[PDB]
Copies of this chain bind each other. A is one copy, B any other.
Amino acid sequence: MNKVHVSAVGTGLLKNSLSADNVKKEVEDLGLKDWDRLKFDDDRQNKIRDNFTTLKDLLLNFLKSKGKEASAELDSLLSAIEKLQHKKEELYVFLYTTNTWNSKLAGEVIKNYLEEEGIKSELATVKSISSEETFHEGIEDLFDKVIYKILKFKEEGKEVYINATAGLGPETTFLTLAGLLAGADLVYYKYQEFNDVVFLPSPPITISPRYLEWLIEFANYGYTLSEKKAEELGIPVRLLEVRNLVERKGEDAYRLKDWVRKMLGIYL
C-alpha cells in the first residue's frame, strides 16, 4: 500500500439516501428528517448514536444498490483510482470527518463499502468548527490528525493523493495547502458537471526560506520576544503580524501562533 488517497467525508450520502423510500421511512420514523445538516450539538445526533449499527447497514445497502454516485467522495475517489490505474492491493484510503454522529455515519459506511471492494482504509475524526474560537482549534486538530499522518506516510515512502472534491470551503483549501507542504504528490478534483477527474496544479511548495529561518529562531526563545530582540535578529515583526504569523501578545512583545508551532512539525 504505497498509494494513499486522502479524503474528507461530508453528509452528502445521508441527503442522497432520502431518495430511497425504505431509508426516508426509517429516517422519518426515527425523527431524523434533516440528518445531513445537524449541527455538532443537536440532540438529534443522539438518535444517530443510539441507532448507529442499523443506520450503517441501511446506508450501506442503499449505497450498494445505487453505486458510487450516492457519495461525491466515493465517486471522486474511485474515479481517480481508475484514471490513475492504481491497483486495489497497492491502495490505502485515509478518510477523515468531523467528530459528529451524522458525519461518522457517512465515514463508516464509506469505509465499509471500500473494504467490501477490497480497499483498506481508516476513518480519523477531527473537532467540529462551530465558531471563530473553535476554527483555530479545528485547524490545529487537522494538523494533528491529518497533516502529520501525510508527513508520516511520505517518510515511509508512500505516494499521497488528496481528493479536493469533498468538504466545506476553508478546510479543503487548508488540507491541500498543508498537505502539499507535508509532501503530498498530487491533488485531484471531480466535477459532477462533465463526470471526469482533473489534476490541480499541485506544485511542490515549502515555507518561504527567509520566513522559515525567522520562525525556527522563535522556537529557541520560548514562543514570545520583546521588540528590541526582533529588530535585534532582523525579524520584521510588522510583516510577521500582517501575514498572521505573530500576535503582539506582550505589550511591546511579539508571540508565535499555535498553528505556526504545529506547522513547524513538518520541518523540525
Enumerate chain A interface residues (CB-CB to B < 8 A): 39, 129-132, 135, 139, 159, 164-165, 168-170, 172-174, 176-178, 180-181, 185-187, 189, 191, 193-194, 196, 198-209, 211, 242-245, 259-260, 262-263
20 residue pairs from A and B, CB less than 8 Å apart: A129-B191, A130-B193, A130-B194, A131-B194, A131-B196, A165-B169, A169-B189, A170-B191, A173-B176, A173-B200, A181-B203, A186-B244, A201-B260, A201-B263, A202-B243, A203-B207, A203-B260, A204-B207, A205-B207, A209-B209
Integer count of this chain's copies in the complex? 2
Cα(A168)–Cα(B165), bound, Å: 10
Which residue on chain B has the smallest CB distance to residue A37? Answer: B193
Contact B185 A201 (CB under 8 A): no
Q: How far is the CA of A178 from the CA of B200 in the complex (A)?
A: 11
A151 to chain B, nearest CB (A): 14
Contact B178 A173 (CB under 8 A): no
Chain B residues with Cβ below 8 Å from A204 are 207-208, 211, 243, 245
B170 x A164 contact (CB < 8 A): yes
Contacts of A191 on B, CB cut-off 8 Å? 129, 135, 168-170
